[PDB]
Design a protein around this ligand. Structure first.
Ligand SMILES: OC[C@H]1O[C@H](O[C@H]2[C@H](O)[C@@H](O)[C@@H](O[C@H]3[C@H](O)[C@@H](O)[C@@H](O)O[C@@H]3CO)O[C@@H]2CO)[C@H](O)[C@@H](O)[C@@H]1O
Length: 580
């Protein structure tokens, strides 16, 4: 991370151009450049890059992700004074408190609403149950009733929760991580209703954010479900729209999750004071929030003064009506596992590949499962796993067990005794498990239970994966002269010795080179060595140079692992020439 500037990550559905305008004002006053980026999957990328001390100085996301980041030590504790805190609503600060510490600045409160086309549907439906009949009416007129994003569980949750579904039970000021409400009767009822809509062709399981937005904004469907960030595109489309309370289900309100868009500071940032100045004195002001809100609406902002100014907007009132029928998202680390579990359940049930009951049963199990620490190790290198709670020397009451490619199911280990397991995984004096040289067959789960004389029990739970770095990639079978107007084989990139497979990518003039566009094609193959299990990849690049184009291209190929266990590897560049 570069000292003396600010890099900000925010999702691509938010007002990033407006935020960049706030950054320009900061730059005018301070000379400090503010770069706003909107990477894909930034909420998954952040914990990867920040864990190694890289990433943005500031990350924006709803507050639900932040407990996990904080637990991993990826966030700086913020230091607003009490006078600053008093400028924002107390419930918004609660959303960004983790283990007693403020770990992000709250920006705005979001909830989904029903958005409807007033020219098609003057009185929007009060119930989910009336939507099939409404769709039949509209289909007869060449339209449809409802389209919304069915790929992300955020959008389907309000219906799943209505009749009794919940994420984690809240009681005594705490979430019970084992009391999950994903496969109860209420969740099943809601998801069954959704799936029936799809079975009856009132909705399509493939509908995503872009498809639903396009259909609504072109006047093809009478309703959608979306948040405040979507309003600006509807304004542009000129559709005469209203924003209103979500339909009820079985007579009960839909319960959207309430998200607080929040800004965290990277623990690894050398620019923490600049970040504080930007967030407190530039962004969290009437003029700062206005700039962002004018780009894509924020909802009900956390800053009291500006929230009061905008409160008269009936779309914001509807957002708050819906929010106040729903639940605040927990910020606990287990929220990630909950969302992944429910995403899978909804996709599998909606596609018909699994019953609602079976999909939700699996999701329940996954969401409530004990957390495991992800461990990675390079093939051939040693690995040490701590038995938390064990005394530093014997006697120790502990038990290691594992479930890997070397075992059928669970194997319980014993103290060293000369048996063959001792050369693969053995218990050290301090109770740790030592694997002298990991291999592919060691991937799996490793667990320790340590018991103390006072009755204390401590469990350690590890999910172990391994990797190998291939040799530097090479380009072979390359053609140094290219002919415009016909396909030319630039060469074949080859990488040998990876685990897992990884992928090869081509680049032209220091930018990625995209297949099937502008006369580019790639033929790829993967081979696995029968004994070692390591992978060899090939990627053959064809290009059709355009006549009059740049006759001096520079190509290169790189290998990347799926997860960043190591850096990309690159070939030397090649510089074939286009000759007439
Ligand atoms: O579905 C897989 C997905 O799950 C998790 O994403 C959840 C977000 O963490 C949660 O905030 C919410 O996201 C919505 C934003 O709050 C809202 O501002 C707007 O951007 O729409 C978002 C939904 O698309 O809900 C999602 C679950 O749908 C997890 O964090 C992700 O890594 C994972 O991809």
């Amino acid at each position: 991370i570069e000292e003396g500037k600010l890099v900000i990550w925010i999702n691509g559905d938010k007002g990033y151009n407006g935020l960049a305008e706030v950054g320009k004002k900061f730059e005018k006053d301070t000379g400090i450049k503010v770069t706003v980026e909107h990477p894909d999957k930034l909420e998954e990328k952040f914990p990867q890059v920040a864990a190694t001390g890289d990433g943005p100085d500031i990350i924006f996301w709803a507050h639900d992700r932040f407990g996990g980041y904080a637990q991993s030590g990826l966030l700086a504790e913020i230091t607003p004074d009490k006078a600053f805190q008093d400028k924002l609503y107390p419930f918004t600060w609660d959303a960004v408190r983790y283990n007693g510490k403020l770990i992000a600045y709250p920006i705005a409160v979001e909830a989904l609403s029903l958005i409807y086309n007033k020219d098609l549907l003057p009185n929007p439906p009060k119930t989910w149950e009336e939507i099939p009949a409404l769709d039949k009416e509209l289909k007869a007129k060449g339209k449809s009733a409802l389209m919304f994003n069915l790929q992300e569980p955020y959008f389907t949750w309000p219906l799943i929760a209505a009749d009794g579904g919940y994420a984690f039970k809240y009681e005594n000021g705490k979430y019970d991580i084992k009391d999950v409400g994903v496969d109860n009767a209420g969740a099943k009822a809601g998801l069954t209703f959704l799936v029936d809509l799809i079975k009856n062709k009132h909705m399509n399981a493939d509908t995503d954010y872009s498809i639903a937005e396009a259909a609504f904004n072109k006047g093809e469907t009478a309703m959608t479900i979306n948040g405040p960030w979507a309003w600006s595109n509807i304004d542009t489309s000129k559709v005469n729209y209203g924003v209103t309370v979500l339909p009820t289900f079985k007579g009960q309100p839909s319960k959207p999750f309430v998200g607080v868009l929040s800004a965290g500071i990277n623990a690894a940032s050398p620019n923490k004071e600049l970040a504080k100045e930007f967030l407190e004195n530039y962004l969290l002001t009437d003029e700062g929030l206005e700039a962002v809100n004018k780009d894509k609406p924020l909802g009900a902002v956390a800053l009291k003064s500006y929230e009061e100014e905008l409160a008269k907007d009936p779309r914001i009132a509807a957002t708050m009506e819906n929010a106040q029928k729903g639940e605040i998202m927990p910020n606990i680390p287990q929220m990630s596992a909950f969302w992944y579990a429910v995403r899978t359940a909804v996709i599998n049930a909606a596609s018909g590949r699994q019953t609602v009951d079976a999909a939700l049963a699996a999701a329940q199990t996954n969401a409530a499962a004990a957390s495991a620490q992800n461990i990675t190790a390079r093939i051939g290198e040693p690995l040490v796993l701590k038995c938390k709670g064990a005394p530093k020397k014997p006697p120790q009451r502990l038990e290691w067990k594992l479930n890997t490619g070397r075992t059928e199911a669970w194997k319980v280990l014993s103290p060293q005794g000369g048996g063959p397991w001792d050369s693969v995984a053995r218990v050290l004096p301090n109770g740790s498990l030592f694997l002298p040289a990991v291999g592919i067959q060691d991937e799996g789960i490793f667990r320790c239970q340590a018991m103390n004389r006072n009755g204390k029990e401590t469990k350690s739970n590890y999910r172990v994966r391994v990797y190998q770095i291939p040799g530097k990639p090479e380009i072979v079978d390359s053609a140094s002269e290219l002919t415009a107007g016909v396909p030319n084989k630039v060469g074949t990139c080859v990488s040998e010795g990876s685990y897992p497979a990884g992928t090869l990518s081509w680049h032209l003039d220091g930018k990625p080179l995209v297949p099937n566009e502008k006369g580019v094609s790639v033929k790829e193959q993967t081979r696995r060595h029968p004994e070692t299990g390591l992978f060899t990849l090939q990627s053959e690049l064809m290009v059709t140079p355009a006549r009059g184009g740049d006759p001096r291209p520079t190509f290169s190929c790189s290998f990347s692992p799926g997860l960043p266990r190591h850096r990309a590897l690159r070939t030397a560049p090649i510089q074939p020439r286009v000759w007439e």
